[PDB]
Amino acid sequence: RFRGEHALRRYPSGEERCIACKLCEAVCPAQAITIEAEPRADGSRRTTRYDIDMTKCIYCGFCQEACPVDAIVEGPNFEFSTETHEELLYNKEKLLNNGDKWEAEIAANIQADYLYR
Amino acid sequence: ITVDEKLDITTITGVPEEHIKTRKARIFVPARNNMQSGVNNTKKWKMEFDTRERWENPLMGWASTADPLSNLVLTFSTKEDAVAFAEKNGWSYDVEERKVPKPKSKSYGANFSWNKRTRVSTK
Amino acid sequence: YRKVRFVGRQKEVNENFAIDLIAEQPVSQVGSRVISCDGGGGALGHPRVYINLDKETKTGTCGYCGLQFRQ
Amino acid sequence: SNLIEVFVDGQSVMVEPGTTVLQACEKVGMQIPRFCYHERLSVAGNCRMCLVEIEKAPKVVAACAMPVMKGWNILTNSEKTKKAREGVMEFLLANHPLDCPICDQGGECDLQDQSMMFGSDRSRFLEGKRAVEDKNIGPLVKTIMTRCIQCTRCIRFASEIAGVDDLGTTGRGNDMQVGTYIEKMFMSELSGNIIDICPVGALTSKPYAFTARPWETRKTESIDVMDAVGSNIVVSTRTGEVMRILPRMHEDINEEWISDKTRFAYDGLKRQRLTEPMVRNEKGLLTHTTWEDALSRVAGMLQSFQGNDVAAIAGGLVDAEALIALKDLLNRVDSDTLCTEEVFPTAGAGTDLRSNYLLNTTIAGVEEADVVLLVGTNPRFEAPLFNARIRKSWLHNDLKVALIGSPVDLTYRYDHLGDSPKILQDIASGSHPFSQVLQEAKKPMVILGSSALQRNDGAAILAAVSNIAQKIRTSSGVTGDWKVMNILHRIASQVAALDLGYKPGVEAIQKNPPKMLFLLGADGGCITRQDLPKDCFIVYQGHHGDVGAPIADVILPGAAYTEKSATYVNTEGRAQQTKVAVTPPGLAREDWKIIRALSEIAGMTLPYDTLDQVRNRLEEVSPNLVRYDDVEGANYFQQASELSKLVNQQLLADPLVPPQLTIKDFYMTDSISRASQTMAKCVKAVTE
Amino acid sequence: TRPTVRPRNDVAHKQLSAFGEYVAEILPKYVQQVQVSCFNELEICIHPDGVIPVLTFLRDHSNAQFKSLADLTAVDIPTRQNRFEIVYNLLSLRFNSRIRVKTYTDELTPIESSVPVYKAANWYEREIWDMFGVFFANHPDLRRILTDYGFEGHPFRKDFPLSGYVELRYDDEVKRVVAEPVELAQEFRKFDLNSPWEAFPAYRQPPE
Amino acid sequence: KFIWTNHKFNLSGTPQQYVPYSTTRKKIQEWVPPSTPY
Amino acid sequence: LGLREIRIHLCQRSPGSQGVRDFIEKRYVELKKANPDLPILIRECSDVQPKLWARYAFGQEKNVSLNNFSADQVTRALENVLSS
Amino acid sequence: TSVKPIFSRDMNEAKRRVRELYRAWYREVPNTVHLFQLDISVKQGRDKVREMFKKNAHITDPRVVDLLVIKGKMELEETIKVWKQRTHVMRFFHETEAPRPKDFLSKFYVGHDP
């Protein structure tokens, strides 16, 4: 149940599991998340911009548990230590890359631990 | 004792910097976000300040700003103690009014007539 | 004007897109009236919603599910 | 006298013999949970969600629709009420989809702001949930009728005020839907106003649809200017951008309703916009410039010209504060020759005390009238909320309405009396029936519209109807005073402009050829360069670039209507100050402060700098521009009506035709209508 | 009512009712309202002239010792016609009981300080001066605690907006560490969470 | 599927350091003047 | 020029202004029968000191303050400016 | 006005109290100019003090003047001793901050109505 780097999962064959329902941004205590949706052309709604500061992130676990569609997950890798403040601001298309560098790591964790919560 | 009665208008200064004469406050009654129908949002006179520029922070798009007041709502109980706070700190203002609706005359059973015009269908 | 921040930084961007990766799904058929999709397996994925599949020309991917669903 | 002393919760209160339990319990400050009951509609009993346990009784009644007899004990909080509200509102939350991630009323919906406060705690169904299918109505209203608590509130709207009887109740039992059985589109004015009425997330907005949840917006009240009566809105900014706007429920105008054009036209604010000052370049070229080039450029020509060779026109949507800095700059140089875009004929009066130029019966007096006659106008597509007030006052008591000219579609049973200007001349005498019902009227009302008065025979029809307004008032007249003759408009900033002391109608510039003009009119093409003399310059000052900004010498930017604290005046002389929402983008500026920096770089420097000093300059000229929202009693036009008999112009031979189409003229009119592409996307769906 | 609902007792609800009955009976010069809290606590409203004596009555006695000052605090309240609210709190170590002393005040009207009665309220009174501006009279050492040397706002009151005016930075223009006007890189979004329908019927205000 | 090849790294300037940017359309879309002919 | 126009202010009540309320009855239709060039303005409510503005000579103000005249003093105090 | 004062009574003990502490600050300008090792001219430090006391002369009331005394009385603790490390004193002299226009036409080029 460890807390660490962020991620955005996606379904079997890809759908970008997020649906921009605006809850992971309303219970960040530190107001890190910054979502701006738009009706995407197919008709299903998605994000356009998604921004998580890694400095205002106080590492609750309040994004991890507010999500209905089970997308944004505090992933279990403390690998960090970049050299510029211009870098630790995350976009959308970092998190997916950072969330598809592993899902064999994350989906082994959540299947063990969803039975309690 | 030494109660030293007199009368002089209480005006305070020194605590803010220059925003005394630049900003006119605004006292209003909030009125019912109309997508719903609950009326607890009324019943408190508030005040709120002016809005100024919001540019773009040219690295992301965060609507960064100066104008350090920008987020202040106070909740006053009445008009009589509304204006009694804009003077004691000493800035200008402008006062709205409370609006309460028509009383009014509605009566189910008047929807069925013999010669009148109010007669509804499709129900 | 803006493009100078990635001079010699390789501009790391996404490679696969799910803007339209819906369409490679063999859109499911049932021959019924209303179907459940708690898609992605039980106790995970989006909550269960019942879609009407009677018209032109598909359910509508549940609003959540994304995957093209039909009869 | 005439009340019943009724005890709510063991506490006395005095109500009229014939109110409801709902209103009486709303007098001592309690809200029973409401679904099937809105104030401005009729009353039905088809959800059963107000259940008061009346004391000393076995049964439980609905507080929506029943009278209040001799003094009951209305016992709200008991142990039988709270077993009913909790039991009714487990029923409807069963057959219902599991949204609120994606349904767009996720902030306000009343299956959600009841069901924490009142109502149950958990669910027992545990499988089922029937699922009907959606359809389309128009490109305004996204319609998901899965959600549908079936409260029959949208259906009683259509049979009421917006008199298109189009929706219905189709089915029996659990199997029923709401929408239109055939595939007919439902579109009129006030058509998008149902998406406030709909108490759950079935009817929701199409252009706004998926942008932002409503706990983040910053509500700042404001007034909308696209129309005669003005409005009462509240804008909703997210990050410095307008997202959507609402009504604000002023009790005399916009009772709770807003116009459809005024709701879906915020897109024209931010699509096709000019941001910077631009230099001449000598060809058909026109290129941008830094702010300190084009200031003394035009201010050089002010010191050269003098007398009536410079003028200005202004007739659009600019306020009554950037129309003082124009008047004190062109008349300290003593060259007035300036008029509005709108044509209004003056015969004996018109700038002085105006005598009928404001709507003398207010909107709150419309519900008191008995015989309304109106001529020369199509009131449906100009000031629609005034039309809806007729629609209400035609119902709920008796009313008799006749119209002259051009058989059009009004939703209530009028009668087309005649179609010529000569009907006016004969009705000054006694003929062509109704003929004396105006004489037999107790509270008359004779409206001239501003569609017919723009014509070439305007000085005749002004004096003709004022004669029959004199004819009625000199008989008795009403009881009583009851001011009779009145007028409406279709341009917002005209009564604000004209009662500063301008002239009406572009005639003074239409005779002579002055050299330089300033255009704040402007997009209506009542002056082109062809009607002007040769390529001597005109300097343009606005915010949109539709027609007139390509044909210009130097253009200057301005802030539109959501960017500046302003003043506007509807058709009763109210004064409704709009407020700041967004600061204007780029190098655009406020309108009246570019005039002082035009003045101060030139010779004359005006004796006012801040906005409070501007409004004292207003209070000098007109003292009723700081008396906000008050209608004073001042008619003074018995002198004016005889003095307006001075001009003896006769009628013409043409039917009094309005410009408006079936609908299609309603959408694309002013300036913000034109650039807004949702008006461009809902106009081709009409024609097909 | 059920499980997961707090069980009350009528023992302490009767004793703390009966005890502080005669704290208004034997000093009716100062005490002007006493009310019993539903969770077995006592509040006692005291005119600000009785700041020292009703403490001094309590401070030593045979029937009410109250020898520990737990918490001195202060609340500001606009729309009261007298702004602030000074709230004392004490502890009967012999008796295991609590009582709170709620004395209203204003800005310019001083309060006689409780330095000589309790020496615990030396630091609890230099602090409140910094955070609101209440001038406690004849204080033996009044100074500047918990704030910087440049604040002039008394920031815990409702007129000081959340971020300050004096956002700080460094420059090499000489060597110094210098102030600036405040300059945020994000708006600090203000959400709206106050939902209608008046869910609490017991605490309901009078209708008017 | 949608898994990477072998691994990656968090390299401070490799020269690649990801240098974050904005991901929106521009907002107001200012109007352009008419053409060089009159 | 001079001149251009004038501005008759009044109040609806507080009856010290009652000279103009007879002046409109006596000399407006007789007044404005003469001078069919000058657009003299009438506005709403000063509520105290019912002044009378004049505006001419490159936009310069001349404000007499009739507080309470007769109906005949207001008849003759207008041609102070109307002649000039 | 039923409220006891702080120190003064009415307009005379107050307006001799404010003249008292001015003689403290006039004496304790040329001490801090070497006690902190700050290199300016000594007449700058005296100009700021005679600037500062004329700012508040619009008062028509006692115990408001007495409130400003307490702030003015307090600063001589920190300033006459060494509690401000060279930086809290130099904030009165806005050396870094750019000049404001304060005239109408220069505001109009830069800034949306400050």
Ligand code: SF4
């Ligand atoms: S993860 Fe959940 S809360 Fe976050 S944006 Fe997606 S749907 Fe909304």
Ligand code: SF4
């Ligand atoms: S860990 Fe907590 S603070 Fe950080 S982004 Fe998630 S919810 Fe926000």
Ligand code: SF4
């Ligand atoms: S649209 Fe839905 S919520 Fe509105 S009245 Fe019809 S069924 Fe009821």
Ligand code: SF4
């Ligand atoms: S309409 Fe009601 S039930 Fe449906 S999603 Fe919205 S709040 Fe939930």
Ligand code: FES
């Ligand atoms: S609750 Fe609406 S019908 Fe009685």
Ligand SMILES: [Zn+2]
């Ligand atoms: Zn699904």
